[PDB]
Design a protein around this ligand. Structure first.
Ligand SMILES: [Mg+2]
Ligand SMILES: [Mg+2]
Ligand SMILES: [Mg+2]
Ligand SMILES: [Mg+2]
Ligand SMILES: [Mg+2]
Ligand SMILES: [Mg+2]
Ligand SMILES: [Mg+2]
Ligand SMILES: [Mg+2]
Ligand SMILES: [Mg+2]
Ligand SMILES: [Mg+2]
Ligand SMILES: [Mg+2]
Ligand SMILES: [Mg+2]
Ligand SMILES: [Mg+2]
Ligand SMILES: [Mg+2]
Ligand SMILES: [Mg+2]
Ligand SMILES: [Mg+2]
Ligand SMILES: [Mg+2]
Ligand SMILES: [Mg+2]
Ligand SMILES: [Mg+2]
Ligand SMILES: [Mg+2]
Ligand SMILES: [Mg+2]
Ligand SMILES: [Mg+2]
Ligand SMILES: [Mg+2]
Ligand SMILES: [Mg+2]
Ligand SMILES: [Mg+2]
Ligand SMILES: [Mg+2]
Ligand SMILES: [Mg+2]
Ligand SMILES: [Mg+2]
Ligand SMILES: [Mg+2]
Ligand SMILES: [Mg+2]
Ligand SMILES: [Mg+2]
Ligand SMILES: [Mg+2]
Ligand SMILES: [Mg+2]
Ligand SMILES: [Mg+2]
Ligand SMILES: [Mg+2]
Ligand SMILES: [Mg+2]
Ligand SMILES: [Mg+2]
Ligand SMILES: [Mg+2]
Ligand SMILES: [Mg+2]
Ligand SMILES: [Mg+2]
Ligand SMILES: [Mg+2]
Ligand SMILES: [Mg+2]
Ligand SMILES: [Mg+2]
Ligand SMILES: [Mg+2]
Ligand SMILES: [Mg+2]
Ligand SMILES: [Mg+2]
Ligand SMILES: [Mg+2]
Ligand SMILES: [Mg+2]
Ligand SMILES: [Mg+2]
Ligand SMILES: [Mg+2]
Ligand SMILES: [Mg+2]
Ligand SMILES: [Mg+2]
Ligand SMILES: [Mg+2]
Ligand SMILES: [Mg+2]
Ligand SMILES: [Mg+2]
Ligand SMILES: [Mg+2]
Ligand SMILES: [Mg+2]
Ligand SMILES: [Mg+2]
Ligand SMILES: [Mg+2]
Ligand SMILES: [Mg+2]
Ligand SMILES: [Mg+2]
Ligand SMILES: [Mg+2]
Ligand SMILES: [Mg+2]
Ligand SMILES: [Mg+2]
Ligand SMILES: [Mg+2]
Ligand SMILES: [Mg+2]
Ligand SMILES: [Mg+2]
Ligand SMILES: [Mg+2]
Ligand SMILES: [Mg+2]
Ligand SMILES: [Mg+2]
Ligand SMILES: [Mg+2]
Ligand SMILES: [Mg+2]
Ligand SMILES: [Mg+2]
Ligand SMILES: [Mg+2]
Ligand SMILES: [Mg+2]
Ligand SMILES: [Mg+2]
Lengths: 23, 58, 78
RNA sequence: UUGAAGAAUGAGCCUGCGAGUUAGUGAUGCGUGGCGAGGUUAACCCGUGGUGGGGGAGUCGUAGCGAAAGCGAGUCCGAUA
RNA sequence: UUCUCCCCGAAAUGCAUUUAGGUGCAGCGUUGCGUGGUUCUUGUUGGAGGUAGAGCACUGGAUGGUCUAGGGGGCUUAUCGGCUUACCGAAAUCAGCCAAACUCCGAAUGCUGGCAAGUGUAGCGUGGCAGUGAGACGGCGGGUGAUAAGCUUCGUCGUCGAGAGGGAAACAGCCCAGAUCAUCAGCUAAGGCCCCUAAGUGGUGACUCAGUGGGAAAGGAUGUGGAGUUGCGUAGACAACCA
RNA sequence: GGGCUUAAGUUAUCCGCCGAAGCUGUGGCAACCUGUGUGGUUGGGUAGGGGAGCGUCGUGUCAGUGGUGAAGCUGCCGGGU
RNA sequence: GUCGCCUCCUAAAGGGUAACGGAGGCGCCCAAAGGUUCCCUCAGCCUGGUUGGUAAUCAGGUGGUGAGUGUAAGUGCACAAGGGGGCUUGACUGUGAGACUGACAGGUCGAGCAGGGACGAAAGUCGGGACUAGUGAUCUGACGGUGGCUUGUGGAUGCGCCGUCACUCAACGGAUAAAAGGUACCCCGGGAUAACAGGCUGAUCUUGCCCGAGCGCUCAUAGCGACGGCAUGGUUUGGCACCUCGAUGUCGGCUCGUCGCAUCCUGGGGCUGGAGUCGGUCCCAAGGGUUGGGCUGUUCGCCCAUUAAAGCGGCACGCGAGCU
RNA sequence: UUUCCGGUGGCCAUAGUGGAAGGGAAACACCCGGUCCCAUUCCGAACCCGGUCGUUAAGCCUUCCAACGCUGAUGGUACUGCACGAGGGAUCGUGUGGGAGAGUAAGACGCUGCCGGAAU
């Protein structure tokens, strides 16, 4: 799903270091 | 013996309990705290164990 | 639906070496719990009914080879 | 509640009211006071004048071990082990 | 389930349960008394191992080759015996392989002793009082599941829970960092410096022209820069143009 | 998000700065440790444990006070962690 | 289906470690299959040999563990713990330094000593079995022994102690000695937990795509697309149990629309074509339009008569404080 | 003292396996008997007893042979503690420590203690 894909891809932001709650 | 100079540059939060206990044994208590230790292999070992948290000099 | 013909297991028995090399022991102290003689009784070490190796005397535990066997000895304390 | 600004619950508003109490010479700690190898009374009696005095029956401490007879700084299992 | 502040500060685990949203015991909190480096970290020194990896000694799985017992098909024709065996083929052997329940091997770590140094005031004994025994996500190593789930169930560390502040547009669990109060001082962390928005429309050298940056696969494509190897070539190459 | 290729994109590198309740400076408070002239360490916090208090009502005692105005209510000006 | 116990794997080289994870076993057996002492070495293979064959018994050669082990599996065991003979009862009584392992109940090992034995020339070994399952707390009752106690005394009787017995208490830490069902007539915390919707996921479904065996007289690619491969969508069936159980009303029609384009018609264009007429297919394109009836509660579907056409989907499978 | 040999340990293949050559003074051994102790789940084969004639054929001993097996670095690689990083995702990379297995060069036809023997 689009929402799931965006949620998973949000972990690629700079301040996060490849990790994010709920992937 | 060259009197190693060790200062803490990163916090102990979220580090491993090994690393936190190593900092305690080195006597560092805050970020920016500095201690002087002899050029002894045990202290070199502590420094290399927490090498990502401290910097060392002479 | 379906079912499993498995799910049974035995309780943990807690085998293994209980006193490692150089560790000071008293007479009668258990050195290793085991099934079969993976370690044979050496000098100063007795073997029990369930193949437990225990100390026959005070001293330090060492692991070695006696002829062709892996053995556990208790060197008498200096 | 893993997680609530939550579209989970309750509350319209104010004022008043509304939930860890009390009784045991209960059990067990602690603080403190008294006395101390002793401590302490209960009922009850006297004080119609009370909160004071008497009352040591009891009760805890003073020796333990054993199922017990028993023995006792030992005792019990045991063979005076 | 009603006033305040000071100090410390959890658990959502194990075992058992007519038990599973309850409870007892242990774990973890606090506190009195006692014992004092016994704890912990690092170094050094010594132990037991069978995981990762790897391997084919074993047990299974397996590809091809050689070779072959022995089975199938034929005839001459068979009681044989022969031609065949151009078909099948155990085993053995050669070469390449596979494995949570394979191992001739075998780490890193971890665990556990001795010694040394460092160290908060850690550890331990024994009493008083608990709460908790519904966990969550992330990293790493696994099982269940479909190479699924913000899934489920373990190992381990972290945060959240019970954590404000900075970053992540917003955004319990990610990153930085643990808030004693005051300050219209300074330096930094992560992250940032065109404007929103504090600080560089920074310097120098490359690349991109797709708004790629600012989501995606098998596959496809004279996009573009750079680095090779190699064939042919002023015996005259590749195109274009006359037989 | 505006907008950005005339990078405000990617990348290598160099020089600066911004940036938190982190660190430092300064002032106040507090817990604990220590030889007791110093100083050191510490003070996010739910369930929960420990410690010390504020306010209300009654009451023993002492000192009182009140129609030259108590309680209560309600302003203002102050005080304490 | 499972519940206690044992072995292996999962288990991440100590120990421990969960799932309705993956494999199996146990509720015994043995008077020798226990103790001791001495002796022995297997399976397989090759050769020869009456019956006799792959394989009985025999001989020689080879062969170190691939046989064997009462019984699962692992760890062991060839020095044998495997095979055989002799003699035996230690498958003892009184004990247990010191440890292992559990929250505990508990589970396990054990040197040394005494008594009285077995075996061995002795050294020595023997408190069952190569090891680890073959088991059940307490209560209550029972039998044997003992004689501690006995309510005035002596008896008796009863009890205590020691040994032992009686539970598929198998839901195996064992609620009672004693127990099955119905509730749509039902009544009185949880979104800790199901049905509906939302969310995640995308197996399935769906829509594409890559490869091109083949089919298409001929001719992979007019048009098709085998075997395989890669994804989209989130509307199908599911998986999950995150939201709501101090209420998020659940099918179809009616009414009112709005949005997507994966276009039914109308508009445009390629390739084929295709004589023309028509068609079919890959692009563009969502402006407008997209009928009325029979059957069934239906969605779906079939049918009748039309039409330029009778599209597919989203909006809590749009829309019950709008209706049905 | 040395050499050689017989016993009895230790390391447990660098020692084994296989092939070749040679040796016995004491010793070991095969060998010769079974009368005697004793013995065969039959057998004086073995065990045991009595001899040491015969014999180095074998055991045993010495020398030689890397042939099978065994031993085996250095360097690299896998993996990995800690710290990070990159992909839509299976998964991958780097820093800092540790670091195999296999394979390669190579080693190796054993080493060592005590007692006894015959000679020196
Ligand atoms: Mg999808
Ligand atoms: Mg035994
Ligand atoms: Mg036994
Ligand atoms: Mg919830
Ligand atoms: Mg609300
Ligand atoms: Mg609201
Ligand atoms: Mg509720
Ligand atoms: Mg309400
Ligand atoms: Mg109210
Ligand atoms: Mg008296
Ligand atoms: Mg605190
Ligand atoms: Mg592997
Ligand atoms: Mg508890
Ligand atoms: Mg519970
Ligand atoms: Mg739980
Ligand atoms: Mg759970
Ligand atoms: Mg958990
Ligand atoms: Mg996790
Ligand atoms: Mg998995
Ligand atoms: Mg989860
Ligand atoms: Mg909570
Ligand atoms: Mg926290
Ligand atoms: Mg925060
Ligand atoms: Mg923030
Ligand atoms: Mg913010
Ligand atoms: Mg600055
Ligand atoms: Mg920075
Ligand atoms: Mg703003
Ligand atoms: Mg510029
Ligand atoms: Mg610039
Ligand atoms: Mg594009
Ligand atoms: Mg884009
Ligand atoms: Mg792409
Ligand atoms: Mg500041
Ligand atoms: Mg601060
Ligand atoms: Mg300061
Ligand atoms: Mg505090
Ligand atoms: Mg703080
Ligand atoms: Mg509290
Ligand atoms: Mg007056
Ligand atoms: Mg009053
Ligand atoms: Mg383990
Ligand atoms: Mg481990
Ligand atoms: Mg668990
Ligand atoms: Mg036997
Ligand atoms: Mg018995
Ligand atoms: Mg003991
Ligand atoms: Mg057991
Ligand atoms: Mg005896
Ligand atoms: Mg005798
Ligand atoms: Mg047996
Ligand atoms: Mg036996
Ligand atoms: Mg009962
Ligand atoms: Mg009487
Ligand atoms: Mg007895
Ligand atoms: Mg049970
Ligand atoms: Mg019962
Ligand atoms: Mg009815
Ligand atoms: Mg109800
Ligand atoms: Mg839920
Ligand atoms: Mg709940
Ligand atoms: Mg649902
Ligand atoms: Mg909803
Ligand atoms: Mg669904
Ligand atoms: Mg579910
Ligand atoms: Mg769950
Ligand atoms: Mg409501
Ligand atoms: Mg279109
Ligand atoms: Mg339309
Ligand atoms: Mg439009
Ligand atoms: Mg139908
Ligand atoms: Mg529609
Ligand atoms: Mg609906
Ligand atoms: Mg409505
Ligand atoms: Mg090697
Ligand atoms: Mg190597």
């Amino acid at each position: 799903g689009k929402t799931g894909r965006k949620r998973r891809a949000r972990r690629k932001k700079g301040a996060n270091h490849g990790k994010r709650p709920n992937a | 013996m060259s009197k190693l100079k060790i200062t803490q540059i990163k916090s102990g939060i979220a580090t491993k309990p090994n690393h936190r206990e190593t900092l305690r044994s080195l006597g560092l208590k805050r970020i920016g705290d500095t201690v002087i230790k002899e050029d002894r292999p045990e202290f070199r070992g502590m420094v290399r164990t927490v090498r990502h948290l401290v910097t060392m000099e002479e | 639906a379906s079912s499993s013909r498995n799910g049974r297991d035995s309780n943990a028995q807690r085998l293994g070496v209980k006193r490692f090399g150089g560790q000071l022991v008293n007479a009668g102290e258990i050195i290793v719990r085991q099934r079969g003689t993976h370690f044979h009784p050496g000098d100063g070490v007795g073997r029990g009914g369930d193949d437990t190796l225990f100390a026959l005397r005070d001293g330090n535990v060492e692991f070695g080879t006696r002829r062709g066997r892996r053995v556990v000895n208790v060197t008498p304390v200096e």
